[PDB]
Structures are given as structure tokens and as C-alpha cells.
Symmetry: C3
């Protein structure tokens, strides 16, 4: 069947692992996954196509990795994640994007901008701020909560839908 290789990136603590686990295992982890990389697989039907999603969950740049860029090199599409209550994580997105563009040696890589932790009220990144950033990249902006599940499927499926346009 059709395999889609997705990679999740973004600043430490934004909820990359929580999002991925919510998608795959349908529960919210309130704890912090100490791993720097992990891999997941989900067989799912997306718009009438039976798909195998291979998802590489990476750690934030704050942590040293084994083979980060080599692992990332294999990705077909990227979720670029920040948290809506963490302004620095939003500001950091541009460096994550630059890293992707370098590692894929292309300025035209399928991507979705994801504002996570939408269940929290201490919001410091307003939706319209994130919409501007996504517009500058020519990509969609989607908000998620790994806690409540809001947007989680939207985010990953939207990324499959971006890959299918490229």
C-alpha cells in the first residue's frame, strides 16, 4: 500500500511526542517521553486510500541526536510544531524550517505548521500571528491539543494531503 513518511519537529516541550502518541495510541501522555528519536506506524484509510503512515518523532534542537539530519532526510513531509503558550517555540519555527530546507536540499518541501496545546488558556501566540507565518511559507496552519485530541487527526492527515500535491 502507499507509505507516507512523516517527520515531527520543533522546540523542546511543545508536545511532538504527545501528538504522535495521541494519533497512534489514542491516549494523552501527561509525562515527558525522554527519547530523542522514536518511530511509529499506523495503517489508516485517508480519503479512500489505504495508507501506511511512518512517523519519525524527533527531539527539539536543544537535545543532541544520533543521525537527526540523516533520519530527517528520509521524510516526505514535516509537521513543524510550536506550542501556543510558548512564544520562543514559535519564534524558533523558522530555524526548523531552514534545517528542513537544507537537509532536503529544496525550498519546496511538504509541511504543515502546528500550534499545539490549544487546550491551555495562557496563550501568547494568537491564531492570526501563526496564520501569517504559515501564509509566508505557503502552507496550512492547524491548531491541536494532544490532551483533548482536537485537531490531531486534522494535522497529520492535512500533511498527507500536502505530500499528495507535491
Amino acid at each position: 500500500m502507499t507509505e507516507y513518511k512523516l517527520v515531527v519537529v520543533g522546540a523542546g516541550g511543545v508536545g511532538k511526542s504527545a501528538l504522535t502518541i495521541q494519533l497512534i495510541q489514542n491516549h494523552f501522555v501527561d509525562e515527558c517521553d525522554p527519547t530523542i528519536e522514536d518511530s511509529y506506524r499506523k495503517q489508516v484509510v485517508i480519503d479512500g486510500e489505504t495508507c501506511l503512515l511512518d512517523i519519525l518523532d524527533t527531539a527539539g534542537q536543544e537535545e543532541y541526536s544520533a543521525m537527526r539530519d540523516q533520519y530527517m532526510r528520509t521524510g516526505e513531509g514535516f509537521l513543524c510544531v510550536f506550542a501556543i503558550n510558548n512564544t520562543k517555540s514559535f519564534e524558533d519555527i523558522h530555524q526548523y524550517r531552514e534545517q528542513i530546507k537544507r537537509v532536503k536540499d529544496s525550498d519546496d518541501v511538504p509541511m504543515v505548521l502546528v500550534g499545539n496545546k490549544s487546550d491551555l488558556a495562557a496563550r501568547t501566540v494568537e491564531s492570526r500571528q501563526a496564520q501569517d507565518l504559515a501564509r509566508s511559507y505557503g502552507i496550512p496552519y492547524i491548531e491541536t491539543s494532544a490532551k483533548t485530541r482536537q485537531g490531531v487527526e486534522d494535522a497529520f492527515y492535512t500533511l498527507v494531503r500536502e505530500i499528495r500535491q507535491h
Copy 2:
């Protein structure tokens, strides 16, 4: 007379000590109180009741304490302080609240959200952002300046008024 045990918490440098000293001693300290805990008492009439306010001034989580949580355990109400020119301090509030909820073993603790340094123009937390957070907690939001005294009495007296509802 009636004693109210108040605790001031929040990120380093937000003005917890300055606020407390303004309330008690009616002056503004432009310097940084190096202490990690200190205690104050003020006999005051609040809405026609003669009250003794006992106020524990704590340091931000960035500094190690002796008995922080044990000391905090004794509090009847908490001022959760951030500074309007310090977005991270606002983002940190939720962890302070979580610490309180743990230490009091309750999700229903009297609290007031306080945005300090309202005399400064480098504002990065807008009033309506802080109002949202306070609304999510079911508590009032009040802005203060330890420098000009704006709001300082409002903040502490409002907290006494919250304790009286619980």
C-alpha cells in the same frame, strides 16, 4: 482577630517582593531582595473587619528554597504574579498554579492572577490575554505597579475577598 494567610508566588524578577513591601511599608524598592523567603504582617481593616494579614513572600522556582512547599502548604490564598513585560513569566503561571494545586491537594484554592509592572511601556502581555487565563481558572485578574502603587491594595484585598468565598 481574623488572620488571613496569603502567599505570593511567580517567576523570578516579576516583583513579588516589591509588591509585598509596597503593601506593608508604603515604598518602592528599586533593588532586588536577595531573600528566598520572608514573612510580613499587617493589621488592617478590610470591608469593616479588623484583619491580620500574614504574607509569605517566596522566590521564583529558579531559586532553590528551604521548605518552599511546606511553607506554601500553610497558605489560605495565593497571588500568582507575572510581569506585563515578561511573556515567559506569564507562560510560567500555569506551573505555579499546578504547584499550588498539588501542595494544597485541591483544585479549588483561592487565587488572584496579578500582572505587575503596569507602569512599564514594554508590554508584551495584553490585558485581554491575561483576562482569558484568569477566566479559565475562575479567578480575577488584576494589574499592579509596585512602583506607583496602582492596584497593590486591590490585589491583596481582592485575594482576602476570594478566601472569604471559599
Copy 3:
């Protein structure tokens, strides 16, 4: 001819050196100038006056300097620079201003507030936030991009125009 002594200050990474090089050498440096101080000169006609601009490019407070304040002491006007995608750099402005006021031993020093990196879409300091800060200081706010050249001449020439009022 008339010499104007300008000093560029602000947080690390905001683009102080990039701005100065764009003005003097008409190109954008995508790399990071490792120096902690450097000096530039440009002979230019500003509003019909032949001027020599002497510009001291300083490093952010995060880096230790030789003679920072002594060097700064010699300045007639200051560009106080933050980046529009770096909320902390904006919050830091007030300390830069305080340092200037100390070193010049005056509360009436010619200054311009500069929001750099206006070519970037990950904006977290809105124009109206920066306009408030500049208004509190009684100084102009100008946005720049060292990359595209937008505003760069405006910023420096505006500062010459402030010095001429003092």
C-alpha cells in the same frame, strides 16, 4: 564637516551588525559577525548637510566587552534595536535605555527605537506594541530589514535628525 557619533545597541542576534553593514557597504550579511565592537565611517549628505557618520557597533549585554560604557559614553545618539521575531529582545530594550541614561548621566539622550528583521513573518512584536514603548520614551519607532534594506537609511538618518533637535 559635521560629525555625528552614533551607537547601535540591543540584545544579541537582533541584527545590529547586519544593519550597520547594510548602511555602510550596501549588502546583507547572512553570517554572524563575531566581533564585540567595531567602528565604521560614512561620508553622506543628509538634508543638504555633508556629514561624517561615525558608528560604533556594539555587541549585546550577553557578551563581555572591553570598555563598552566608555566607548558608549562618546555617543551622541543611540539606535536601540530589537528584532520583531524576538519578544525577549523587545522586553530587554528598557535595560539598554537605562544603561544609556546612566552612561550619559542624562534622561534626555537622542534615541530611535528600531524593530529589525521586518522581512520575517514570525512576528511576535506587533507594530503598535513598539509604538507604545517609543511613545513612552518620546522617540520615534522605525522598522528595518538589514536583508531587504527596508528602513535602514530611515533609521540612521532619523537618528541624525533627533540629535539635531537636542
